[PDB]
Amino acid sequence: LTSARSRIEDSDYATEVSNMSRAQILQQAGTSVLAQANQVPQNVLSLLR
Amino acid sequence: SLTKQYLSVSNSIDETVARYKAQFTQLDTMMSKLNNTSSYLTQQFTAMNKS
């Protein structure tokens, strides 16, 4: 019964570590692309005159 | 009768001692399995964190 409960409940560290890595990376890349996106409109400002 | 009863009780006691020891042996085998598994899990965590 202990083994059965382990199966139903216990997580897998390997899988979860890979997941965390993927998440951290998506987050960092998102921050970067946001930095690039914020700039976009300012190309307009050059046409201020 | 009395040394006879001793024969009987000695025999019964011996059966019981074998039983207890056997239970302990099987339990320790289970320990072996779990220890090995957790140990390699631990090394994996240490390395992937060193990452």
Coordinates of N, CA and C in Angstrom, one line a residue, chain B residues 17-33:
Chain B
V17 N 12.7 -17.8 17.0 CA 13.9 -17.0 16.7 C 14.1 -17.0 15.2
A18 N 14.0 -18.1 14.5 CA 14.1 -18.1 13.1 C 13.1 -17.2 12.5
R19 N 11.9 -17.2 12.9 CA 10.9 -16.3 12.4 C 11.3 -14.8 12.5
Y20 N 11.6 -14.4 13.7 CA 12.0 -13.0 13.9 C 13.2 -12.6 13.0
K21 N 14.2 -13.4 12.9 CA 15.4 -13.1 12.1 C 15.0 -13.0 10.7
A22 N 14.1 -13.9 10.2 CA 13.7 -13.9 8.8 C 13.0 -12.6 8.4
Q23 N 12.1 -12.2 9.3 CA 11.4 -10.9 9.1 C 12.4 -9.8 9.0
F24 N 13.4 -9.8 9.9 CA 14.4 -8.7 9.8 C 15.2 -8.8 8.5
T25 N 15.5 -10.0 8.0 CA 16.2 -10.1 6.7 C 15.5 -9.5 5.6
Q26 N 14.2 -9.9 5.4 CA 13.4 -9.3 4.3 C 13.3 -7.8 4.4
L27 N 13.1 -7.3 5.6 CA 13.0 -5.9 5.8 C 14.2 -5.2 5.4
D28 N 15.4 -5.7 5.7 CA 16.7 -5.1 5.3 C 16.8 -5.2 3.8
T29 N 16.4 -6.2 3.1 CA 16.4 -6.2 1.7 C 15.7 -5.0 1.1
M30 N 14.4 -4.8 1.6 CA 13.7 -3.7 1.1 C 14.5 -2.4 1.4
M31 N 15.1 -2.3 2.5 CA 16.0 -1.1 2.8 C 17.0 -1.0 1.7
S32 N 17.7 -2.0 1.3 CA 18.7 -2.0 0.3 C 18.1 -1.3 -0.9
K33 N 17.0 -1.8 -1.4 CA 16.4 -1.2 -2.6 C 16.2 0.3 -2.5

